[PDB]
Design a protein around this ligand. Structure first.
Ligand SMILES: [Zn+2]
Length: 591
């Protein structure tokens, strides 16, 4: 009002004489009905509603909201070495049609820059919810947005969360601007009753459900088909699944304090299931196996499939080309374990003996001579043994969290140099355990030289030289000897499976995890009887494996088995070979 100041713009001057602030949610003291009626008609209707209490309560719950801040997704995908999470953390619950004019009244923004985004559909061969849409700049105060297209509105508020300007921003989308669809928020709305009511009153093709860690944005008519009246067990289940994967990654230091974005599940009208940057997807005809917990638990693969897909979002730090369809199964297997119904997936260690010692294979071509067709069933046991030993047997219950930390320090992309990355993984695993895991990684094929090109979502030079191998072994040798020969570990018993299940014959007779956990010792008088190439072990059930070694127990590994009866392959050289039993702690006993 001094001469030094520019006048306020015209509408701002008028609104701020009737209303407490530019959000127009409260009538200022001693304003008259005449002052209300001199407003533009659009704002008359709102002043009226705010003066009287005629704002439909349902409408108000979404038309007036304070939007909390969320972190930036590109920044955190880089720092955490993941695929990008969603930035659709902030639904408004308002839908629109092309040509709609939308008034958006933005309160104090504390210097933050925010926008509004309209999210609809994409696809050529079928349709799915898009990961982005029309973006509209927002400024503090009055905004009029004219919709280029239909969809639902999301507030885009992404910033540094620690800063004390990172506060919620109050935004009023008043009456007459678009359509209230609503959305369900777990913490705010709390109950299945509230969910059922919100869904009922919604009208849009899609309805948004916001959990703590994951969000659903699924076809309305499917939610009505499968879960008309309940969402809580569905949303808690998928929150837990995402949370359990996050647990292993050792990121509690930054989540939720600095990174808080959700994963965002859509329902494409095609494909099957997948995860990538910005969104994960479940074909809309499959949604019965997502939204009902009983369907999730009714078959092994109903939790496995989705867990696997989400694991792709999280694998990069510890993954490298050749492993891309197995390394995420650390997460799939952790989720099966957590849910408590089924046993772990993967081949048995016989597959690894066969690959390594019968066929001369290394990690990159383990069970795959083609170098482009990963034997995921064999590979997936590697990360999982590390979990079974350090976590399930409790020898180091923060092993994985530590290894993820170290691999994030290593900061190698999955594809830049996989031959080097496999060694960095072995070195960091040793560092994480504070143990020399040479024997483990030797068995798993990490110490064979490679010079070739593989294909796995791209062509990659795979190069592992003797010097790299020597450097890594020297590196790992600085740590104390491991307490157990847990390269022979299992978390499954033959009797847990039907006889035509692939695991029944695969898993072997010895090496079960309790033998490691109870530091079992071999006391009985083990003996071996050989006939041709066939080996039979008598009273050897206290062992965890049997080895064939050149010259003595410190010589090269020629073959191994976790069965008490096995054949030695034709290819193995027998002169100078000797046979041993392995007890859990790594003592070898001549047979
Ligand atoms: Zn996959």
């Amino acid at each position: 009002r001094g001469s030094h100041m520019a006048s306020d713009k015209t509408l701002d001057k008028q609104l701020l004489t009737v209303f407490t602030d530019i959000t127009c949610t409260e009538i200022k003291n001693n304003v008259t009905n005449e002052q209300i009626q001199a407003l533009p008609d659009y704002f008359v209707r709102i002043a009226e509603a705010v003066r009287d209490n005629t704002y439909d309560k349902w409408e108000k719950e979404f038309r007036i909201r304070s939007y909390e801040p969320y972190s930036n997704i590109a920044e955190w995908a880089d720092k955490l070495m993941t695929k990008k999470y969603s930035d659709l953390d902030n639904p408004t619950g308002i839908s629109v049609k092309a040509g709609d004019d939308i008034i958006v009244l933005v309160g104090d923004t504390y210097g933050q820059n925010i926008s509004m985004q309209c999210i609809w559909e994409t696809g050529t061969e079928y349709k799915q919810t898009a990961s982005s849409g029309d973006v509209y700049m927002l400024n503090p105060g009055v905004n009029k947005l004219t919709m280029k297209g239909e969809g639902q509105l999301f507030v885009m508020y992404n910033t540094e969360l620690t800063s004390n300007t990172a506060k919620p921003i109050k935004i009023h989308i008043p009456l007459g601007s678009g359509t209230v669809n609503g959305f369900f928020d777990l913490k705010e709305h709390k109950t299945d009753e509230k969910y059922a009511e919100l869904l009922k009153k919604s009208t849009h093709k899609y309805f948004c459900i916001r959990g703590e860690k994951i969000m659903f944005y699924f076809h309305r008519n499917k939610l009505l088909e499968y879960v008309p009246n309940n969402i809580l067990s569905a949303i808690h289940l998928w929150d837990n699944i995402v949370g359990w994967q996050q647990e292993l990654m050792g990121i509690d230091d930054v989540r939720p304090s600095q990174v808080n974005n959700h994963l965002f599940a859509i329902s494409p009208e095609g494909s099957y299931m997948w995860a990538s940057d910005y969104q994960i997807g479940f074909v809309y005809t499959y949604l019965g196996n997502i939204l009902l917990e009983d369907n999730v638990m009714a078959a092994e693969d109903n939790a496995w499939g989705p867990a696997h897909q989400i694991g792709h979002v999280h694998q990069a730090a510890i993954n490298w080309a050749s492993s891309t369809e197995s390394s995420n199964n650390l997460f799939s297997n952790f989720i099966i374990y957590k849910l408590g119904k089924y046993k772990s997936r993967g081949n048995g260690l016989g597959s690894v003996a066969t690959a390594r010692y019968a066929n001369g294979q290394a990690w990159y071509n383990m069970g795959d001579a083609t170098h482009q067709n990963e034997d995921t069933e064999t590979h997936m046991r590697m990360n999982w043994q590390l979990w079974i030993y350090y976590h399930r047997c409790e020898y180091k219950t923060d092993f994985w969290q530590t290894l993820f930390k170290l691999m994030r320090e290593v900061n190698m992309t999955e594809g830049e140099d996989p031959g080097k990355k496999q060694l960095e993984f072995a070195k960091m695993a040793s560092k994480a355990a504070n143990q020399n895991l040479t024997d483990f990684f030797e068995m798993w094929g990490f110490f064979e030289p490679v010079n070739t090109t593989i294909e796995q979502y791209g062509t990659y030079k795979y190069y592992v030289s003797d010097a790299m191998i020597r450097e890594a072994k020297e590196y790992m040798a600085q740590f104390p000897a491991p307490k157990h020969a847990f390269q022979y570990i299992e978390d499954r018993k033959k009797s847990e499976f039907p006889s035509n299940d692939y695991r029944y014959s695969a898993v072997g007779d010895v090496g079960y995890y309790t033998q490691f956990k109870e530091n079992q010792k071999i006391t009985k008088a083990i003996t071996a009887e050989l006939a041709g190439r066939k080996v039979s072990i008598q009273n050897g059930d206290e062992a965890v494996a049997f080895e064939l070694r050149e010259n003595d127990e410190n010589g090269k590994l020629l073959y191994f088995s976790t069965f008490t009866t096995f054949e030695i392959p034709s290819s193995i050289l027998m002169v100078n070979a000797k046979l041993y039993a392995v007890q859990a702690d790594g003592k070898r006993i001549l047979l």
